[PDB]
Amino acid sequence: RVLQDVFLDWAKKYGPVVRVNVFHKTSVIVTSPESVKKFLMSTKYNKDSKMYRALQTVFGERLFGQGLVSECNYERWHKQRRVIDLAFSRSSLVSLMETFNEKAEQLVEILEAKADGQTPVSMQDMLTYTAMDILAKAAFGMETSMLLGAQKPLSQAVKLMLEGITASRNTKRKQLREVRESIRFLRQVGRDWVQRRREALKRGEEVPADILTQILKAEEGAQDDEGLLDNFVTFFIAGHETSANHLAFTVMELSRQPEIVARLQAEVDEVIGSKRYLDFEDLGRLQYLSQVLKESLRLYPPAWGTFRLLEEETLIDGVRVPGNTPLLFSTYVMGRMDTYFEDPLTFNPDRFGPGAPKPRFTYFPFSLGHRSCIGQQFAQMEVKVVMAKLLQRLEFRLVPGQRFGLQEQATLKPLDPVLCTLRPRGW
Numbered sequence: 001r002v003l004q005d006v007f008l009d010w011a012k013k014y015g016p017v018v019r020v021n022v023f024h025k026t027s028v029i030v031t032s033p034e035s036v037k038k039f040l041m042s043t044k045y046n047k048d049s050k051m052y053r054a055l056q057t058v059f060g061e062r063l064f065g066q067g068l069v070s071e072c073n074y075e076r077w078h079k080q081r082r083v084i085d086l087a088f089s090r091s092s093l094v095s096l097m098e099t100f101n102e103k104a105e106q107l108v109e110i111l112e113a114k115a116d117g118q119t120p121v122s123m124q125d126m127l128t129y130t131a132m133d134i135l136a137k138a139a140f141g142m143e144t145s146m147l148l149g150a151q152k153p154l155s156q157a158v159k160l161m162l163e164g165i166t167a168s169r170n171t172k173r174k175q176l177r178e179v180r181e182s183i184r185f186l187r188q189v190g191r192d193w194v195q196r197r198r199e200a201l202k203r204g205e206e207v208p209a210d211i212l213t214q215i216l217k218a219e220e221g222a223q224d225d226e227g228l229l230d231n232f233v234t235f236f237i238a239g240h241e242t243s244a245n246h247l248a249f250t251v252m253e254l255s256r257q258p259e260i261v262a263r264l265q266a267e268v269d270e271v272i273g274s275k276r277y278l279d280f281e282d283l284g285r286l287q288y289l290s291q292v293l294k295e296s297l298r299l300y301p302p303a304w305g306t307f308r309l310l311e312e313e314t315l316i317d318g319v320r321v322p323g324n325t326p327l328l329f330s331t332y333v334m335g336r337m338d339t340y341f342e343d344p345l346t347f348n349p350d351r352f353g354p355g356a357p358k359p360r361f362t363y364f365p366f367s368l369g370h371r372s373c374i375g376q377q378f379a380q381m382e383v384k385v386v387m388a389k390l391l392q393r394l395e396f397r398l399v400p401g402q403r404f405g406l407q408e409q410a411t412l413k414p415l416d417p418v419l420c421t422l423r424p425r426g427w
């Protein structure tokens with residue numbers, strides 16, 4: 001049971017507008033679809049600086065700073081977004097299919113090597129290394145090779161940093177210094193990878209355009225590299241953590257969903273076959289898998305929502321909310337309200353079937369409007385590639401004792417590490 005589950009009880013009991021404490025700050029959780037549409041779908045409402053200070057700096061160390069997630073002032077964010085947007089064109093994402101295929105295939109062979117049916121493997125960790133290996137190469141041109149046992153300190157540094165964000169937001173000498181040491185380590189990797197890119201361009205090398213290209217470009221007239229490093233850390237973390245968490249939750253759920261797995265296997269067989277490389281066009285045709293990933297997001301959204309600063313006293317669903325109040329919007333909460341979803345605890349991918357009305361402002365795992373996930377299509381593409389490959393080659397069985405609950409760190413993720421034993425598909 002996480003804090004979001006408490007918010008859900010209160011949304012259900014006390015209605016569509018409810019004053020709550022979150023990250024030790026006062027806020028009003030707003031759960032009507034009409035309010036979601038009103039506040040997220042208009043550029044008039046912007047993020048609440050107060051609620052994002054916990055990402056901007058941690059334990060007296062700059063982290064996300066004023067990067068793309070944590071920048072709340074419209075015009076300023078709009079300056080970065082417009083530039084960084086180019087790195088996410090249809091043609092830019094198509095060019096990444098190689099990275100996604102490579103890392104996915106590497107993942108599967110490591111797993112196939114352990115596929116005896118008695119070797120416990122943490123799918124949470126495995127999926128974390130994959131997501132990080134994908135992001136690092138795709139966004140920055142660098143190989144972290146975590147799948148191959150490499151970069152243990154970097155890995156540890158991300159682990160501690162996320163724990164840092166958590167404790168910061170929820171009220172021991174050593175962990176305090178480790179978190180500071182991890183954050184500094186992280187921004188240091190940043191300058192080195194930035195250093196590497198600039199030096200390569202100073203030797204007149206042809207570097208294919210990526211995310212780093214656009215983050216450098218967004219920081220032209222900068223007295224220092226701090227903005228760029230804000231955006232470096234932003235992408236490094238945002239660009240793998242929630243993707244790994246989404247994947248972990250999907251694998252965990254599917255382990256107790258044998259009929260759904262058969263449909264998925266049946267579908268993977270038709271569209272890709274035993275083919276090794278997935279083409280861009282292959283993704284679109286994996287429609288039942290798309291429905292299952294959507295349904296995984298409804299029940300288990302890694303990023304549970306967002307805040308919008310309400311500048312003036314306003315009437316929200318017959319409720320007078322005082323000005324300068326942070327509005328909380330929770331896709332986690334709405335997804336679990338029987339008011340919006342019939343039998344809400346039932347994992348049913350048929351909810352997203354062809355022909356079913358799309359949810360109207362009751363489902364937003366990538367948020368909505370101008371502050372929506374810039375990485376949506378990136379994430380959706382990479383996770384489809386990863387799952388497709390797993391569904392081709394492997395079957396998982398959750399190790400007895402493995403629980404299905406959640407935890408909240410910087411994001412939602414499984415409470416248990418999704419320990420599985422594996423067999424080749426068919427065994």
Ligand code: HEM
Nearest residue numbers: 069238239242243246303306365366367371373374375379
């Ligand atoms: C399944 C994976 C993903 C989910 C669930 C997810 C979710 C979201 C959500 C809900 C937001 C809004 C956060 C807020 O209001 O504070 C967001 C922001 C964003 N995400 Fe993701 N994310 C995903 C993957 C990615 C990846 C792969 C990228 C980069 C490649 C990324 C980059 C961004 C960043 C930079 C922002 C800031 C957007 C802006 O306001 O300009 N996301 N994402």
Ligand SMILES: N[C@@H]1C[C@H]1c1ccccc1
Nearest residue numbers: 069237238241242303410
């Ligand atoms: N892109 C996803 C939502 C963002 C995120 C992940 C981890 C920490 C902070 C932000």
